[PDB]
Write a protein that binds this ligand. Structure first.
Ligand SMILES: CCCCCCC/C=C\CCCCCC(=O)OC[C@@H](O)CO
Ligand SMILES: CCCCCCC/C=C\CCCCCC(=O)OC[C@@H](O)CO
Ligand SMILES: CCCCCCC/C=C\CCCCCC(=O)OC[C@@H](O)CO
Ligand SMILES: CCCCCCC/C=C\CCCCCC(=O)OC[C@@H](O)CO
Ligand SMILES: CCCCCCC/C=C\CCCCCC(=O)OC[C@@H](O)CO
Ligand SMILES: CCCCCCC/C=C\CCCCCC(=O)OC[C@@H](O)CO
Ligand SMILES: CCCCCCC/C=C\CCCCCC(=O)OC[C@@H](O)CO
Ligand SMILES: CCCCCCCCCCCCCCCC(=O)OP(=O)(O)O
Ligand SMILES: CCCCCCCCCCCCCCCC(=O)OP(=O)(O)O
Ligand SMILES: [K+]
Ligand SMILES: [K+]
Length: 193
C-alpha cells in the first residue's frame, strides 16, 4: 500500500544524505583525500576532530532511527514495512542516490534502526562495539563483532522473523562493505587507533 511505499522511499532518500560529506565540504576538506577516504564518522573524526565525528555519528544514526520509528509506530515491530524501511535507510547510506555522494558502511545508520526497535538491544550492541574497540583499537573489528551481536541479541530477546530478516540482511551488507578491512585484519595490517 501507498503509505508503506512512501515511507520506504523516504527512508532511502534520507539515508542517501551521507552527512560526513555535508560537514567535510563545509570546511573545504576533500574527505576522499584525508585518512582512509571514507565518509563515515570514523574518517570525519580522523580528519576534522572527535567533536565532528560525534556529530556525524548522531546525524547518520538519526536517518536510520527516524524512519524506523515511524514504521514501528505506524505499522508495528512485527510489520515487514519496518523490515524494508530499515533496509532502505542503510542501503541509502551505502548506495546514495545523489550523484555526488559516495556511500559509507552503514554502521551508525543501522544502529539507529535497531534503537527504534529496542533501545535495550541497541545499547547492548553499542557496548559490544565499545568493548571490542577499547580492547584492540580497530573500528572495523568492533563494527563487525557488534553487528553480529545485534542479531544474536534480537534473537534471544524474542523479536520476530521480520526483524531477524532485517538484521541478517543489514548485517550481511555491513560485513560486505568491510571486505577490505577484513583482509587487513587477517594480516595484522588494519589501521589502529
Ligand atoms: C529505488 C526506489 C527505492 C524503493 C523501492 C521500492 C520499495 C519496496 C517495497 C515497499 C513496500 C513494502 C511493503 C511491505 C508489506 O508487505 O507491507 C504490508 C502492507 O502495508 C503493504 O501493502
Ligand atoms: C544506542 C546509542 C548509544 C550511543 C551513546 C553515546 C554516543 C556517543 C558517541 C558515539 C560515537 C563513538 C564514540 C567512540 C569513543 O568515544 O571512542 C573513544 C576512543 O577514542 C578511546 O577513548
Ligand atoms: C554476544 C557478546 C559478544 C561479545 C564479543 C565476544 C566475541 C569474541 C571475540 C570478538 C572478536 C575477537 C577477535 C580477536 C582477534 O584475533 O582479532 C585479530 C587480532 O589480530 C587483533 O589483535
Ligand atoms: C553467556 C552469558 C550470557 C549471555 C546472554 C544469553 C541470554 C541472556 C539473556 C536473555 C534474556 C532475554 C529477556 C527478554 C525476553 O526474552 O523477553 C521475551 C519477552 O520480551 C517477549 O515480550
Ligand atoms: C556476561 C553476560 C551478561 C548478560 C546480562 C543479561 C541481562 C540483560 C537483560 C535482562 C532482561 C530483562 C527483561 C526485559 C524484558 O522483560 O523486557 C520486555 C518484556 O518482558 C515486556 O513484556
Ligand atoms: C550482501 C548480502 C545481501 C543479501 C540480500 C538477500 C535478500 C534475500 C531475500 C529477500 C526475501 C524477501 C522476503 C519478503 C517477505 O517475506 O515479505 C513478507 C510478506 O509476508 C509481507 O506481507
Ligand atoms: C561474536 C562473533 C564475532 C565475530 C568477529 C569476526 C571478525 C572477522 C574478521 C577478523 C579476523 C581477525 C584476524 C585473524 C587473526 O589474526 O587470527 C589470529 C587469532 O587467532 C588471534 O586471536
Ligand atoms: C545491526 C547493526 C548493529 C550495529 C552495532 C554497532 C554500532 C556501533 C556504532 C558506533 C560506531 C559508529 C562509528 C562508525 C561509523 C562510520 O565510521 O561509518 P558508517 O559505517 O556509518 O559509514
Ligand atoms: C564487551 C562486552 C559486552 C557484553 C554484553 C553482552 C550481554 C548481552 C545480553 C543479552 C541481552 C539482550 C536482551 C535485551 C532485553 C530485552 O528484551 O529488552 P526490551 O527490548 O524488551 O527492552
Ligand atoms: K576503511
Ligand atoms: K551516488
Amino acid at each position: 500500500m501507498g503509505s508503506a511505499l512512501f515511507l520506504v522511499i523516504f527512508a532511502y532518500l534520507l539515508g542517501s544524505i551521507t552527512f560526513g560529506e555535508v560537514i567535510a565540504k563545509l570546511k573545504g576538506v576533500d574527505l576522499r583525500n584525508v585518512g582512509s577516504g571514507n565518509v563515515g564518522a570514523t574518517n570525519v573524526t580522523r580528519a576534522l576532530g572527535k567533536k565532528y565525528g560525534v556529530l556525524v555519528f548522531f546525524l547518520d544514526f538519526l536517518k536510520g532511527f527516524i524512519p524506523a520509528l515511524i514504521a514501528v509506530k505506524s505499522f508495528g515491530i512485527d510489520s515487514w514495512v519496518l523490515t524494508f524501511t530499515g533496509l532502505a535507510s542503510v542501503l541509502g547510506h551505502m548506495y546514495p542516490v545523489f550523484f555526488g555522494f559516495k556511500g559509507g558502511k552503514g554502521v551508525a545508520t543501522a544502529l539507529g534502526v535497531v534503537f527504534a526497535v529496542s533501545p535495550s538491544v541497541a545499547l547492548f550492541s553499542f557496548l559490544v562495539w565499545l568493548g571490542i574497540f577499547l580492547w584492540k583499537r580497530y573500528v572495523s573489528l568492533a563494527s563487525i563483532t557488534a553487528t553480529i551481536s545485534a542479531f544474536l541479541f534480537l534473537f534471544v530477546a524474542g523479536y520476530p522473523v521480520n526483524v531477524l530478516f532485517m538484521a541478517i540482511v543489514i548485517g550481511a551488507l555491513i560485513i560486505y562493505r568491510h571486505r577490505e578491512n577484513i583482509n587487513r585484519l587477517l594480516t595484522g595490517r588494519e589501521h589502529r587507533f
